[PDB]
Design a protein around this ligand. Structure first.
Ligand SMILES: CN(c1c(N)n(Cc2ccccc2Br)c(=O)[nH]c1=O)S(=O)(=O)c1ccccc1
Ligand SMILES: CN(c1c(N)n(Cc2ccccc2Br)c(=O)[nH]c1=O)S(=O)(=O)c1ccccc1
Ligand SMILES: CN(c1c(N)n(Cc2ccccc2Br)c(=O)[nH]c1=O)S(=O)(=O)c1ccccc1
Ligand SMILES: CN(c1c(N)n(Cc2ccccc2Br)c(=O)[nH]c1=O)S(=O)(=O)c1ccccc1
Ligand SMILES: [Cl-]
Ligand SMILES: [Cl-]
Ligand SMILES: [Cl-]
Ligand SMILES: [Cl-]
Lengths: 296, 296, 296, 296
């Protein structure tokens, strides 16, 4: 136990009224994507990147529920802490809210409703996580880049501009909801002004690194799935996508107890205890099977 | 001493740990089925039976959230009351919990995780609602009767036995989660002894009515969909099913605002106000279109 | 000189290049919807109307394949004939191609890519089939009327105009792909002039009947599913929709063997033989179960 | 044009009666998976492995249809040839049928109903394709390894046995439907005897390489999708899986014209011509867009 290198933040704050009435009772990032709470996925992304000290930011109403779901992290070899965003005034506000949590360390922000799947994903993040200066982002080809921060490249494949929700996007490349930053991000976030939309823009954070030549924009290839959670239709597809992978394989995607176990943050003895409450359903069954099966 | 309509109950309590970890932060009946919380579907079903006075039974933990979503019903021409079920002791327990709520009235119990769709469904509920003594249930042909209460019929089509979760079902006709009762149900329920599963069984209730010759079983035809919400798989399918119908039709299934509007429990002016806070999203836009479209 | 029942047509011709490359090797109406060829669904629809004598219209290239699948109908208590449509010149062309087949009889046209599901669907088809003069069509509320023939109603609910693919639909009520005709349709069809699209339009046919006051439009309610097969997306959804119903119920939608059995066009002994060559798979096992289960 | 290094074979032969009636009219590998014929996927796998000379083996009935779909290959920079398997007497029969096509060259067999997706898939195949001696296979963790050829590993992660459809599988690792072989496979196939099931087993081919220490079994990781096409349910999931990837990305999976174009087997001028017939639908639109868009 802990009373209060790279730190993680999950920004799991309010989506406004766009998925109401589904999200009227509870924020989106506590709803299941197939067999597990949405937040398990970005949590799992951070743990895959090797990050164990992690701040979860949510609305004032829902922190108790996040706190309840995940606890202090210790049962999974994590050190979790919690903070609140009172209004949805931009994703960069994560760096103001998390300022004292970050301290003097390196950091990474993941959106709490972002789903990543694919091969060698541990290596793709460990590469960004090892770059100790500047920021690292990921660009992914999408059909509807107007909804996102859009990267423009020159003919030699070098990032030359970023634009948030452009009316005429410059490419089909969109910045995904996963960001790695050095010790400069907090101080860049403090200097931000609200945009025409009344938000502290993460795209402004990232343009400040671009303007200094310190932004690494790596291509996240078509062979990776960055799954859309923005619409009722896209939530549905995501659960369909995860279910098809888990049913085919008899292996789970973004099972935090398993990831902990593979990183050796918990031992056999602890995994076994975590299997015990859930032993009557499939998820406890999965976790027990992992004790005696070799999975390459 | 000397003496001189039908209330509804929705049971939306603990699904224990069945669907953990998806349901760890929030109870099943608030998870979305496509674009609206699951509890809207059975609420709509009672509304369609003509029932305006309704008791929602939930866990102590989740009652506030049902209340936040649903309020007192006044916005939709209903009256909603709340009660808690501290321990999931079985479905027949709704009648003890709801004894003061029911009083000397007729009742209807609906499971808070049961979705229905189909044609003349209003009329099928009308005929059970207007049967003023005894009980009515609905029998539906399912692939896996062993999971349900099962009705055995004789060669005349008459109901002759009921068995809860039989290993060797006598038919494929499962009893759906919607039950209509006369003034005898509370007394029947008080006398029940817990099953060996540690549960007060709705099927024991229906058997009492059967043994007194006061149980109408109606067939809910194959042209109706009675959807499965028991697993992560079936839940996903339930969302796909609704999405497909609403995207095809430009009409919603189980939109409580709409149903109150068509029942004339609320007027055009009242519906316009309900639309306003959701005007940016599709749900609010749909409520608005209903004002100026004849829909047959 | 001196003179003294209803045939069906299924149009399963060229979808041109719309769904190429999926449909390059094989026509649309033979692609599966879940577990059975698409053409089974509209065939089943005619069977449900009581119609036993049926002409299948396909491309010259694909007729052998319809014939290999369906034969002459004798196995299922029907009589199937075949005709070809060398150029996709429009739906009303079915009446010229099928003129000798129809003779002096009543008719019914069904599109070979149109799926229907719902309750009392038998009865809804019964009332159109038994209307012996004029034409009957069905109007269904859709999200995208602009893609269909659209019915405009006056405030009494009476059909007053029909428009093919209007840019500004007068209602959301599209005319479904199922049409019932008296002995005037062939003559109406011979007189049509091609539309500017180079097509003989079914909607022109229905307008002739409207202008003579002999067009019944019945509403196919929202409790019916009329499924979309026009796109790769909608097709996939159509398979998901059927799969969900059949997996839930342990019953099939549009199983022609079953429907002949229940119509008493074939007997138990005949159905047992049809089951045999499919006995290893689920379809054959289902046919076998139908012999020894009462299904209401 | 060509009249009749590594060669490819696609075995797209009969699945018997297990998907009847869906497959009664046409073999499975000509049915669409979402927007394209199933065979496009394994074709695309071979082209991704750098293989351009390719033999397509099908039933006698369906060769004309495969021939019709794909032609001589020349429009896509391939050299296709066709041959027939008269009865389904085992996957190893591909090497007897293809003996003279193979000649003295290296070879690779892909099953015509196998779908692969994932990142760095070009590199994973180019590694197997470069190993000039022995055979290379892939092992993938699945839920139901009894259906497949199953690999057993020792504690150091070395393949020590292969078993075809074991009643008690030794691991959850299954051999996928993609095989690379040197000049020995033809002569090993000729010496095979039929199994207890009356088939020339590909697993026997691969055990012969294992017994000689010449089988490379590489793990295909959980971050890759090997999609199941064996059941109606699994076909459906696959089309759902592909559609979700293509709709999110605005990029296609296994578009052979695109792969050809990226390998430089056809130029801009040719791609443009292939866009022309399909210009009115999305797939022609996709191909034209590829002329003027840089996709990393
Ligand atoms: C399918 N993936 C996955 C894995 N690859 N792994 C393997 C794993 C686990 C711990 C450390 C490295 C690796 Br590789 C795992 O244990 N769980 C997984 O869900 S993943 O890398 O694409 C992924 C991990 C976490 C969140 C989202 C996807
Ligand atoms: C699709 N259905 C439906 C309707 N039929 N209706 C029409 C309606 C509304 C009020 C009273 C009668 C009728 Br009919 C509606 O307004 N909303 C609906 O969702 S239903 O009858 O099958 C249904 C009602 C309530 C919950 C689930 C399905
Ligand atoms: C689900 N339906 C259905 C049925 N209702 N029936 C029952 C049936 C059969 C023959 C005659 C009347 C009736 Br009811 C059946 O045997 N197979 C069916 O698929 S349906 O009436 O909506 C339908 C029939 C034909 C094609 C598509 C749907
Ligand atoms: C999504 N994939 C994919 C690609 N990766 N590519 C990129 C590509 C194309 C040609 C040569 C190398 C690469 Br990388 C492509 O052009 N089409 C694709 O479908 S894939 O490598 O996983 C794949 C290719 C072919 C069949 C099945 C999957
Ligand atoms: Cl990639
Ligand atoms: Cl019915
Ligand atoms: Cl209806
Ligand atoms: Cl992997």
């Amino acid at each position: 136990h802990h009373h209060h290198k790279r730190k993680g933040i999950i920004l799991a704050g309010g989506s406004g009224t766009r998925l109401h009435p589904a999200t009227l009772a509870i924020s989106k990032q506590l709803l299941p994507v197939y067999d597990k709470p949405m937040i398990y996925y970005p949590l799992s992304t951070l743990m895959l990147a090797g990050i164990r000290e992690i701040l979860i930011i949510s609305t004032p109403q829902d922190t108790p529920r996040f706190q309840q779901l995940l606890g202090d992290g210790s049962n999974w070899g994590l050190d979790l802490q919690y903070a609140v965003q009172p209004s949805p005034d931009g994703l960069a506000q994560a760096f103001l809210i998390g300022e004292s949590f970050i301290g003097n360390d390196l950091s990474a922000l993941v959106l709490g409703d972002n789903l990543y799947y694919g091969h060698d994903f541990h290596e793709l993040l460990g590469s960004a996580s090892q770059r100790q200066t500047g920021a690292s982002v990921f660009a992914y080809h999408v059909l509807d880049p107007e909804r996102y921060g859009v990267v423009e490249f020159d003919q030699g494949g070098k990032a030359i501009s970023l634009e948030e929700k452009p009316l005429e996007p410059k490419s089909n490349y969109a910045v995904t909801g996963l960001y790695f930053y050095d010790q400069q991000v907090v101080d860049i976030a403090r200097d931000l002004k609200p945009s025409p939309r009344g938000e502290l823009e993460i795209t402004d954070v990232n343009r400040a690194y671009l303007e200094r030549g310190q932004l690494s924009v790596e291509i996240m290839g078509r062979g990776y799935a960055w799954l859309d959670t923005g619409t009722h239709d896209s939530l549905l597809e995501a659960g369909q996508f995860i279910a098809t992978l888990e049913n085919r394989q008899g292996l789970k995607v973004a099972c935090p107890e398993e990831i902990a176990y593979r990183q050796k943050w918990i031992d056999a003895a602890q995994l076994e205890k975590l299997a015990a409450p859930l032993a009557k359903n499939g998820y406890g069954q999965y976790l027990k099977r992992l004790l005696t099966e070799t999975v390459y």
